[PDB]
Amino acid sequence: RFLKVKNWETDVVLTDTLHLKSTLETGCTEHICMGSIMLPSQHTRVATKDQLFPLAKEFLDQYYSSIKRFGSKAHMDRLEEVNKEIESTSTYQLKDTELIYGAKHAWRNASRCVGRIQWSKLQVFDARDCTTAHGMFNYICNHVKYATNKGNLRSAITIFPQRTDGKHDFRVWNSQLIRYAGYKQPDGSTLGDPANVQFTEICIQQGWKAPRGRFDVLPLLLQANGNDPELFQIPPELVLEVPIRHPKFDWFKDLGLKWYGLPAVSNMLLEIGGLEFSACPFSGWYMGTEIGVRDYCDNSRYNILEEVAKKMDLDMRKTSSLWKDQALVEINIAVLYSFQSDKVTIVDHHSATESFIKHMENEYRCRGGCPADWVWIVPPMSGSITPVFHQEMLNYRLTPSFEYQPDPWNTHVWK
Amino acid sequence: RFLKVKNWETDVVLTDTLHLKSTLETGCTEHICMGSIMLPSQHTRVATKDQLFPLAKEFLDQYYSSIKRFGSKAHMDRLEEVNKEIESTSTYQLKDTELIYGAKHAWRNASRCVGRIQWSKLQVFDARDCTTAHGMFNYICNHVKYATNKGNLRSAITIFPQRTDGKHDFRVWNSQLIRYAGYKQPDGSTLGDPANVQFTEICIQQGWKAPRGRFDVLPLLLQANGNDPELFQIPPELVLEVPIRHPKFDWFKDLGLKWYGLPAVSNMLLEIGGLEFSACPFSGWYMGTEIGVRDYCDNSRYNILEEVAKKMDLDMRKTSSLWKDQALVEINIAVLYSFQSDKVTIVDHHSATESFIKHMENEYRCRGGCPADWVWIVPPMSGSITPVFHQEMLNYRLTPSFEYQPDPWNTHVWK
Ligand code: HEM
Ligand code: HEM
Ligand SMILES: Cc1cc(N)nc2cc(-c3cccc(CN)c3)c(F)cc12
Numbered sequence: 170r171f172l173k174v175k176n177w178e179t180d181v182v183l184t185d186t187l188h189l190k191s192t193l194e195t196g197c198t199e200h201i202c203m204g205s206i207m208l209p210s211q212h213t214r215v216a217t218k219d220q221l222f223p224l225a226k227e228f229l230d231q232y233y234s235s236i237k238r239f240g241s242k243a244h245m246d247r248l249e250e251v252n253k254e255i256e257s258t259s260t261y262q263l264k265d266t267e268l269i270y271g272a273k274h275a276w277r278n279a280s281r282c283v284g285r286i287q288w289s290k291l292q293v294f295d296a297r298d299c300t301t302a303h304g305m306f307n308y309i310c311n312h313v314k315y316a317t318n319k320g321n322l323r324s325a326i327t328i329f330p331q332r333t334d335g336k337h338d339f340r341v342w343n344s345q346l347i348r349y350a351g352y353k354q355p356d357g358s359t360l361g362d363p364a365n366v367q368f369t370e371i372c373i374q375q376g377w378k379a380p381r382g383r384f385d386v387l388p389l390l391l392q393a394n395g396n397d398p399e400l401f402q403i404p405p406e407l408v409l410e411v412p413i414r415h416p417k418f419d420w421f422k423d424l425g426l427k428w429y430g431l432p433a434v435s436n437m438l439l440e441i442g443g444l445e446f447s448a449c450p451f452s453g454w455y456m457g458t459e460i461g462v463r464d465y466c467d468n469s470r471y472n473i474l475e476e477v478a479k480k481m482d483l484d485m486r487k488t489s490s491l492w493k494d495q496a497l498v499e500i501n502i503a504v505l506y507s508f509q510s511d512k513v514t515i516v517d518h519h520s521a522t523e524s525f526i527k528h529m530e531n532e533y534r535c536r537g538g539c540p541a542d543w544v545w546i547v548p549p550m551s552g553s554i555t556p557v558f559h560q561e562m563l564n565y566r567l568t569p570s571f572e573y574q575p576d577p578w579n580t581h582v583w584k
Numbered sequence: 585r586f587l588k589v590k591n592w593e594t595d596v597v598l599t600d601t602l603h604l605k606s607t608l609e610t611g612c613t614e615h616i617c618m619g620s621i622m623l624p625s626q627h628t629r630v631a632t633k634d635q636l637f638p639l640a641k642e643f644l645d646q647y648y649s650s651i652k653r654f655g656s657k658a659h660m661d662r663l664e665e666v667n668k669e670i671e672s673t674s675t676y677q678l679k680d681t682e683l684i685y686g687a688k689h690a691w692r693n694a695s696r697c698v699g700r701i702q703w704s705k706l707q708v709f710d711a712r713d714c715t716t717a718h719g720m721f722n723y724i725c726n727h728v729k730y731a732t733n734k735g736n737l738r739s740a741i742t743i744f745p746q747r748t749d750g751k752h753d754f755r756v757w758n759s760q761l762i763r764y765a766g767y768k769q770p771d772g773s774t775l776g777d778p779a780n781v782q783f784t785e786i787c788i789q790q791g792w793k794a795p796r797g798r799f800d801v802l803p804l805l806l807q808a809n810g811n812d813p814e815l816f817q818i819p820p821e822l823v824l825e826v827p828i829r830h831p832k833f834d835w836f837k838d839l840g841l842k843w844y845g846l847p848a849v850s851n852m853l854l855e856i857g858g859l860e861f862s863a864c865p866f867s868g869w870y871m872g873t874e875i876g877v878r879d880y881c882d883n884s885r886y887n888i889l890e891e892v893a894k895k896m897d898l899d900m901r902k903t904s905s906l907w908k909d910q911a912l913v914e915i916n917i918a919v920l921y922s923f924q925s926d927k928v929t930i931v932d933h934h935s936a937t938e939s940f941i942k943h944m945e946n947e948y949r950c951r952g953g954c955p956a957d958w959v960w961i962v963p964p965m966s967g968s969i970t971p972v973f974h975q976e977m978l979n980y981r982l983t984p985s986f987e988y989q990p991d992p993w994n995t996h997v998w999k
């Protein structure tokens with residue numbers, strides 16, 4: 170109730186009181202810790218009219234307290250105002266300013282995100298007036314253009330109409346706005362991104378004509394107000410890409426690798442005051458390792474370690490030659506150098522984890538804590554030589570938040 | 585109560601029922617996860633006569649069930665036999681075979697240990713007849729000689745008399761049997777191992793004459809039956825060491841690095857059936873990364889990244905040149921090659937984490953689970969390209985176990 174987290178590389182000590190305001194549950198118990206379960210049963214997402222006003226009052230009480238007007242008349246009138254609208258319609262509508270606050274704090278409370286030092290500079294695009302798949306395509310294009318900003322990336326979220334009944338639900342079926350396609354081969358191996366093989370054939374199912382190459386940017390599949398989703402191709406000039414080259418190894422270009430500049434996740438759900446926004450794509454910029462470690466070297470992904478190590482002339486017989494580690498560092502030096510040479514915003518895992526420690530200092534000071542998931546904060550390479558490896562972290566679930574949600578193609582009453 | 589852990593690199597699914605037998609607590613709650621707190625308040629260590637028989641009966645019930653004699657007469661007579669001895673003396677004495685079983689299962693249940701595939705081949709040296717610091721020195725020397733086995737390392741534990749009253753307590757004050765000394769300098773920097781700077785001056789306090797070099801093997805500080813601890817120097821021919829060289833970089837020898845062959849931790853407490861063994865050094869062999877990543881590159885340790893990167897001719901201005909990662913992989917290739925060229929048993933983090941997955945399969949099959957701490961299982965470099973990064977793990981505390989304990993010099997009623 171006044172718990173302490175220690176840093177063991179600096180002996181810095183911090184006191185968490187923010188975990189007291191925590192509301193959601195973790196999945197752990199006194200006799201079990203599930204801190205390494207990937208999609209815990211609590212991190213996923215239907216609510217009745219009854220539970221909705223405590224959730225609104227809870228939200229509005231932090232909102233007005235945050236603009237130095239806690240408990241005043243403007244706050245009490247708004248509590249009553251929402252109360253009455255939840256009487257009338259059994260739901261309610263957020264003010265524009267309450268929507269911006271709730272979105273910025275969902276990101277703030279995302280314990281698995283190492284980038285949250287920037288949480289307050291989030292551009293919020295209100296798309297709650299949207300009604301059709303084409304309207305969503307327009308909103309998403311304007312999002313992609315704004316956030317990309319010619320390589321000077323800017324953080325943003327686009328918020329589509331909230332869930333109401335549950336059957337009229339806006340959904341982006343893509344897991345990200347910009348993703349490369351995955352194609353299964355006759356022999357069984359995979360061209361493109363294996364992660365998206367199931368989605369790539371859903372697009373062909375709905376009528377996509379696939380170029381059947383490596384880095385083919387998938388189309389968007391947009392579902393508006395419960396209707397069946399529709400295909401649209403993002404204008405190519407809006408999809409900024411970085412060809413990957415090395416600042417020593419000239420043969421690195423021959424690999425013919427590239428990645429997109431904009432990481433923009435679209436399959437998650439934003440929860441604000443008890444309201445659920447099922448379509449809410451949000452974007453930032455990449456930490457290098459998400460591309461060069463996970464995207465490029467996960468076994469179940471592009472899996473390029475063996476062909477990079479070949480061209481490096483590496484001892485690939487013994488596991489203990491660390492040829493895998495050795496080729497992994499070159500691939501990440503290449504992604505960083507490539508993005509930087511092209512003036513596309515990217516951050517390295519050293520600078521981003523030093524920034525998160527800096528962020529943690531600020532949240533324990535001006536908020537009394539920072540929910541943080543070590544399993545996810547620690548970068549996927551060189552963990553112990555980044556300062557977050559030695560920083561104890563308390564994980565707890567605060568709201569507003571981002572939550573996972575099932576894929577629409579396994580839950581949609583089709584047609 | 586029938587929880588499931590998934591592997592996301594293979595889609596292999598396992599069912600944990602062993603967590604049902606769990607007894608100790610984790611530190612997490614429904615509203616908080618402390619899976620990244622290093623020394624949780626539960627992982628540390630005085631017990632009365634009352635709670636001691638459930639703990640014995642609990643232990644003896646798994647022991648006899650494990651040798652295919654559950655609930656027989658030999659088991660019921662032993663339950664009564666211990667019962668009566670706990671009536672008489674309010675403690676009890678383990679059979680030789682109950683001691684070997686309890687020790688092997690403490691290691692089996694160590695969720696932070698990636699090496700547990702070997703848990704059943706542990707050599708147990710019973711030192712419960714010891715009474716003096718010199719006797720302990722003799723037992724520890726025989727341990728070091730046996731486990732080292734001329735570089736063909738063998739796992740072992742030496743078990744000193746159990747705690748009874750609490751004031752007559754056997755303790756090894758060293759954190760490990762073989763550790764390098766740490767000396768503070770006039771300017772403030774550190775010669776040797778910074779980790780041991782506080783211990784190195786306790787030895788000089790008790791009269792150690794320090795050679796004041798880099799890799800000076802500390803003396804042993806042995807406390808017998810509550811008496812004040814005494815200094816003894818391990819015969820140098822028993823301390824096997826590996827000079828560190830690279831299989832490409834000839835300048836790597838110039839660094840003048842070496843490490844000891846035998847990892848043998850002596851500051852922890854073994855708990856079996858409610859009995860507490862305060863001195864119980866145990867040893868195995870090294871995973872490469874414990875030396876080349878943590879020992880050599882932790883900021884608060886030897887911290888050799890900058891001087892390795894210098895001699896590598898690295899771009900050391902920008903953080904995003906990944907010069908740190910690049911020099912870290914060379915240092916670990918060197919430790920592995922050095923130990924192997926000298927026929928000292930070492931394992932690389934790839935082979936050890938593939939073995940642990942293999943181990944996890946066996947424990948979920950023939951035991952119904954495997955307690956495992958992801959925060960500690962995942963190696964400190966190249967996390968995601970080893971199979972444990974993608975393996976969900978349930979952590980829970982089973983007994984017999986190894987526990988942490990305070991340092992004796994902050995708890996001993998001195999003289
Ligand atoms: C500004 C640049 C940003 C950087 C460098 C960054 C970095 C990261 C990284 C590396 C992860 C782990 C991802 C993975 O391993 O696949 C992550 C997770 C996440 N990020 Fe951030 N991010 C940024 C912006 C944002 C923004 C703007 C939002 C939301 C508006 C956001 C929300 C999230 C969420 C919700 C998760 C994980 C959700 C979960 O699994 O519970 N991030 N971020
Ligand atoms: C056989 C070769 C072994 C290998 C390769 C191995 C490997 C490891 C490694 C890498 C760690 C993490 C250590 C660190 O990061 O500082 C660890 C922890 C640990 N090992 Fe093993 N180990 C071995 C044998 C043993 C044996 C024989 C025992 C006990 C009899 C043991 C008990 C433990 C315990 C109790 C911990 C962590 C305790 C805690 O923090 O709760 N290990 N091991
Ligand atoms: C906005 C943003 C930026 C970034 N640099 N990275 C991000 C990574 C994720 C993410 C979270 C969980 C799983 C996955 C992979 N599907 C990605 C995310 F939501 C948003 C990210």
Ligand SMILES: Cc1cc(N)nc2cc(-c3cccc(CN)c3)c(F)cc12
Pocket residue numbers: 759847848849866867868869870871874
């Ligand atoms: C036996 C054995 C072998 C090995 N290869 N490694 C081991 C590492 C530890 C260990 C556990 C917690 C903290 C520390 C560092 N003080 C070491 C340990 F107890 C025993 C180990």
Ligand SMILES: C[C@H](O)[C@H](O)[C@H]1CNc2nc(N)[nH]c(=O)c2N1
Pocket residue numbers: 177558559560561562620621622959960961
């Ligand atoms: C903060 C964190 O709990 C602490 O640094 C832990 C993280 N994981 C670790 N894992 C291992 N194997 N060894 C360690 O010392 C640590 N340190």
Ligand SMILES: C[C@H](O)[C@H](O)[C@H]1CNc2nc(N)[nH]c(=O)c2N1
Pocket residue numbers: 205206207544545546592973974975976977
């Ligand atoms: C098994 C484990 O929970 C899973 O692989 C997690 C581990 N930590 C991670 N950390 C990040 N940043 N991203 C991930 O996808 C994962 N995967």
Ligand SMILES: [Zn+2]
Pocket residue numbers: 197201202203204612613616617618619
């Ligand atoms: Zn937990």
